[PDB]
Amino acid sequence: MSLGYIVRIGEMAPDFTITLTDGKQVTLSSLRGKVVMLQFTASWCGVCRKEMPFIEKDIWLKHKDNADFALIGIDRDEPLEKVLAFAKSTGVTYPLGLDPGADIFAKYALRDAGITRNVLIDREGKIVKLTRLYNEEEFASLVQQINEMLKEGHHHHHH
Structure with a gap:
């Protein structure tokens, strides 16, 4: 469908261990406790060519480290070489x-x-x-x- 979410607002995020562009395995468990931004993108997406650059510029470049910030971009289907060839052309640090x-x-x-x-x-x-x-x-x-x-x-209640 169009907006086919199986997960909802206020729901807890499922775990996983995804391989990054530089061959890194990161588990979602390790990112918890911190603010985790997960973008679901793809090299064949044109809209993301607005999404990702903006995310990088005003989100990533600002808070990428912080101490408690985590930002990982996930490609839906395109393999290693695709993502590398795409990211390098969009910038995406x-x-x-x-x-x-x-x-x-x-x-x-x-x-x-x-x-x-x-x-x-x-x-x-x-x-x-x-x-x-x-x-x-x-x-x-x-x-x-x-x-x-x-x-x-x-x-608000602190907890």
Whole structure:
């Protein structure tokens, strides 16, 4: 379908260990406790050529390290050489992971339900922000929320 999410806002994010562009294996467990931004993209996506550069510019370049920030880009199906040839041409200084077969993608959404989407995982490990194909306004709000997420005041009760 169009927006085929199997996971919802407020739901906890499934775990996985994805291989990055430089041959790194990263488990989602290790990223929890920190703010984890998971973009689901693909080299054959044109919309992501707005999404990713903006994400890099105002999200990545700012908070990439911080102390508690994590940003990983996942390609839905295109293998190693594809992603490398794409990332280098878009810039993308943030590591992209290969998901050959849309398995990690299928752990969040239907493989046959589009592609362009961003999953913002909170400090607890819950998905708080669903965004569609970047989207100007949603990106603006997403970035602002990220600034908060690094601090975490949306709990309000502290817990």
